[PDB]
Design a protein around this nucleic acid. Structure first.
Lengths: 62, 132, 380
RNA sequence: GGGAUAACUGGCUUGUGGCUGCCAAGCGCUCCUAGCGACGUAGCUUUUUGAUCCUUCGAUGUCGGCUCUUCCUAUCAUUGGGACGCAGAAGUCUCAAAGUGUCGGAUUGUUCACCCGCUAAUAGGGAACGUGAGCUGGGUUUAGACCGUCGUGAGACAGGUUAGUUUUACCCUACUGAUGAAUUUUAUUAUAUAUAUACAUAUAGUAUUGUGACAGUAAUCCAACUUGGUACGAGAGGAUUAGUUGGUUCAGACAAUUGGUACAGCAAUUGGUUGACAAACCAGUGUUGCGAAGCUAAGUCUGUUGGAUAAUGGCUGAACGCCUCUUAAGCCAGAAACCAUGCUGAUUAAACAAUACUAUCUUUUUUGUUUGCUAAUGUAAAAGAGAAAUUAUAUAUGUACCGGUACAUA
RNA sequence: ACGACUUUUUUGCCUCAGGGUGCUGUAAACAUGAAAGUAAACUUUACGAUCUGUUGAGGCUUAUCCCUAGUGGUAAAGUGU
């Protein structure tokens, strides 16, 4: 029915906003922003990202 | 076979060096010309995924060096808008060599392949490990 | 001698002069033509461009590569306050063109109508339309009879209601609308009965219709030839400049051959965009106005944070397929096609899957403020 | 000193070059002419090279490329056709056609040339040998230098090579945009109550709505599939035609949404400095990371159909008992051409219409108009400025009958 | 560019402020919090890049963002006809 989830955040994927990267490994990575894309490009792990919901969950602050 | 193809953003100028993606023994493909390309003073010949290029082999088997051969692009660095509502792009640039009658010269396409291009050219869908 | 290699000329000769329009309001060049069998009806409407959104639509398109599968498309939103008819115009055919015989007015008019005539509404005694406050009803009837007898084209003098808008301007746009259909008498009866009422876009148009769009473009002032006409840029080596002009041309004419590209005005031009499909005609009192058969969720058309420089939608609105000429906030003129379009796409009936209401300021994901709050949770 | 005299344009001519002819001996199985066409012979042109020395030497900047626009047709392709040596598929000769298109490289000082490749095809020319106050300066062609040959020599060489300043628009016009008065020797396609009326109307000032003469113009080509492995063909092969879906080029917009963009703005960080500290500052934007928003494409949307026709295919049909597309009268259908339509402009019409309100003022009568000013005069046409059937033209108008018939009348 | 054009001039507008919308990424302050080690008492007391907590914190968001009849403001008084 309604659109899929972001997984980099809780968010629904609203169309147009997202872009898709297919890696050499055959792995797709779906980005909901340029900011997310740059983080991925610089290849920096989630466990250093104090702002993000995954970090908050990782440190059990939800 | 339908050969119809909805527009994909222009990419890969001639002189681009792209992966050969098969057990042909080619490692790279240097695209020297595009087949079907329009007339224009300004444009370099430019190719999307579904375009048939003409290439030469810069690294690869010795017979394949010098000689000109057709290819179809399978992996592409530049993003395009798929009508499903997202912009798709690949990590690398790659195509697979073929005949001027469109018969396959490869044996097995090692990387992933854009799905619209794979269903475009039957012999690539057959040979392809994964559909994008 | 002839050029070694051929190459099409830069820009269209047919849209010289590339100069400023003399009115903010769109100007209809020509109206829809004779159809006696059709009943009388309005041809045109002014509305304000509020912004753009995207849509998800399910596609039929027989034999297409996409075919059955769903598409995502850009769309324009035009807030449409109901226009009010205030006058009747009677035109007559002459070998010198259409000429007005007379105009007949309503029995009262708006302040907003009167504001358009006054340059200094604030510092005036507002005496317009006060001898012409009333005349005998016999005089009015005689003029109507006279117009029926002799006139062969009927237009209605209509005006915008900017008081139903957030915009700085309080002056109405006043406008002629041709009425196309049956006999002059049947038309006259139609305009008279309609007169003092307010016309929603739903009273003028049907969803799925193809529509012609009349507007002045977004400005940019005086610009160089590269920008204005798109010529190939100068070499790396030059005595002077790089956006500096090419050769003007031959010694014969011993004058500048006018077809040459030149520096000057770019944008604020009058332009007709053709055949834009109406994807939805929205309703003012609907709180579900952005929702779809797939979504079925209470949700107004207004974006998250509203439209840029316009905010909330509070009146009826037109959801139009694709691009529209001019700035956001600009009045935009809708006209019916001069001959009705006949095509697959014209005949086709739109089924939306989604209408976006996300932000258009930043990358604000959320459809609703409620969704944003729900994500974030507790606050200080 | 020199246009008394070259190199540059132009000009005359057109030998030379190019293009088109006429013909009929052969070739084309067979067959003059489907296609050809000699031996011969006629024209046209100046994108050739010459011949030339009228024009300019108190200077017209001396090649080419780049860039940019327009014109031509002697059409290469796209549109419509005609012929064929034509079964189809092709293909070949040909006509109306200049609406539209005619590319990427490799090698050159290069027009030219020559490969490789795409293309749908990669036609040919003009514009002061298109285009140096548009550029460039590689080349011929200043002064330095090198090698060969020739010259006793100094030196010489359309012999080859390297190095070598490209000055000024602020004028007038042009063009592009941007403002803008003013115009009763001027206008009027009607006005007034089913009837009138130029011997007549029209102030002006603001403001809205518009009129639209006139000027400009635009959309473009290809592919795929289905028709159809059918018609057609002995087989091999193998369509016209539509239809559907796509793509190229141009154009016009637009920025939802991707990308691009930062001296809006937060964070980080290098070197120094304010005692530390938070706070901060400085280094022509110190430097990074993110970056709304506004611009923008490599992102997104949109880009008519009538009329009159051309080539042509035909019809009725004479001259000429028959025949004949008219190489007589009368006609018809017919093209990317043409004109409207559409769209853009319209202080391109010293243009105009309708509407709204207003300026002690308008209207009728009398007398006057032989410190810049403060009573005030101008007419291009008075002399009876007299005169509203109408299709006509190898016949008209009434009237009577049912656009025709009959009867009058000019 | 400048004229010009679009507006509004108290059912407004400017102004700030609040909210919305966002953008950045968790401020200062404090922890007898954690922290590679260090030294000095007779197990206790010193020093310490850094990290976590208080803390989706702090900052910034019309300049050409949106909403608000929320605050205070809103003059000259000229000129042509």
């Amino acid at each position: 029915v309604k659109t899929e989830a972001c997984s980099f955040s809780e968010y629904r994927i609203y169309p147009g906003r997202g872009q898709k990267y297919i890696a050499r490994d055959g792995k797709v990575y779906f980005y909901l922003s340029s900011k997310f894309a740059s983080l991925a490009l610089q290849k920096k792990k989630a466990a250093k990202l104090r702002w993000t919901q995954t970090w908050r969950r990782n440190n059990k602050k939800t | 076979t339908l050969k119809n193809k909805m527009r994909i953003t222009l990419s890969l100028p001639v002189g681009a060096l792209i992966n050969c993606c098969d057990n042909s023994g080619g490692k790279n493909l240097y695209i020297i010309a595009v087949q079907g390309f329009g007339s224009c003073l300004n444009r370099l010949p430019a190719a999307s995924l579904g375009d048939m290029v003409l290439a030469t082999v810069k690294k690869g088997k010795p017979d394949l060096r010098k000689k000109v051969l057709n290819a179809i692009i399978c992996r592409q660095s530049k993003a395009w808008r798929r009508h499903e509502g997202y912009y798709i792009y690949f990590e690398d640039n790659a195509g697979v060599i073929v005949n001027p009658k469109g018969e396959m010269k490869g044996s097995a396409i090692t990387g992933p392949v854009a799905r619209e291009c794979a269903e475009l050219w039957p012999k690539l869908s057959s040979a392809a490990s994964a559909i994008v | 001698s002839h050029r070694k290699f051929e190459r099409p000329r830069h820009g269209s000769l047919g849209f010289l002069p590339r100069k400023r329009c003399k009115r903010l309001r769109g100007k209809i060049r020509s109206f829809p033509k004779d159809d006696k069998e059709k009943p009388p009806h309005f041809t045109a409407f002014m509305g304000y461009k509020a912004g753009m959104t995207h849509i998800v639509r399910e596609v039929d398109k027989p034999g297409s590569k996409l075919h059955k599968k769903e598409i995502v498309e850009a769309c324009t939103i035009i807030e449409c306050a109901p226009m009010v008819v205030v006058g009747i115009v009677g035109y007559r055919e002459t070998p010198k063109g259409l000429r007005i015989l007379s105009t007949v007015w309503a029995n009262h008019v708006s302040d907003e109508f009167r504001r358009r005539y006054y340059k200094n509404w604030y510092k005036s005694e507002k005496k317009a339309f006060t001898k012409s406050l009333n005349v005998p009803e016999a005089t009015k009837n005689c003029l109507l009879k006279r117009i029926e007898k002799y006139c062969t084209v009927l237009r209605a003098i209509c005006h915008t209601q900017p008081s139903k808008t957030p915009l700085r301007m309080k002056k109405a746009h006043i406008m002629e609308v041709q009425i196309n259909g049956g006999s002059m008498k049947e038309k006259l009866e139609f305009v008279k009965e309609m007169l003092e009422k307010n016309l929603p876009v739903s009273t003028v148009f049907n969803p799925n219709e193809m529509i012609d769009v009349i507007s002045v473009t977004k400005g940019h002032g005086t610009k160089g030839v590269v920008s204005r006409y798109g010529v190939k840029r100068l070499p790396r080596k030059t005595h002077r400049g790089l956006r500096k002009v090419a050769c003007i041309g031959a010694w014969h004419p011993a004058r500048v051959q006018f077809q040459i590209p030149r520096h000057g005005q770019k944008g604020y031009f009058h332009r007709t965009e053709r055949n834009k499909k109406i994807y939805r005609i929205g309703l003012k009192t609907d709180k579900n106005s952005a929702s779809t058969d797939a979504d079925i969720t209470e949700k107004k058309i207004t974006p998250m944070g509203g439209f840029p420089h316009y905010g909330v939608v509070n009146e009826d609105f037109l959801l139009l397929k694709g691009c529209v000429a001019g700035t956001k906030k600009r009045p935009i003129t809708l006209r019916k096609n001069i001959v009705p379009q006949v095509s697959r796409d014209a005949l086709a009936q739109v089924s939306l899957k989604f209408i976006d209401t996300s932000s258009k300021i930043g990358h604000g994901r959320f459809q609703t403020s409620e969704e944003k709050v729900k994500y974030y949770g507790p606050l200080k």
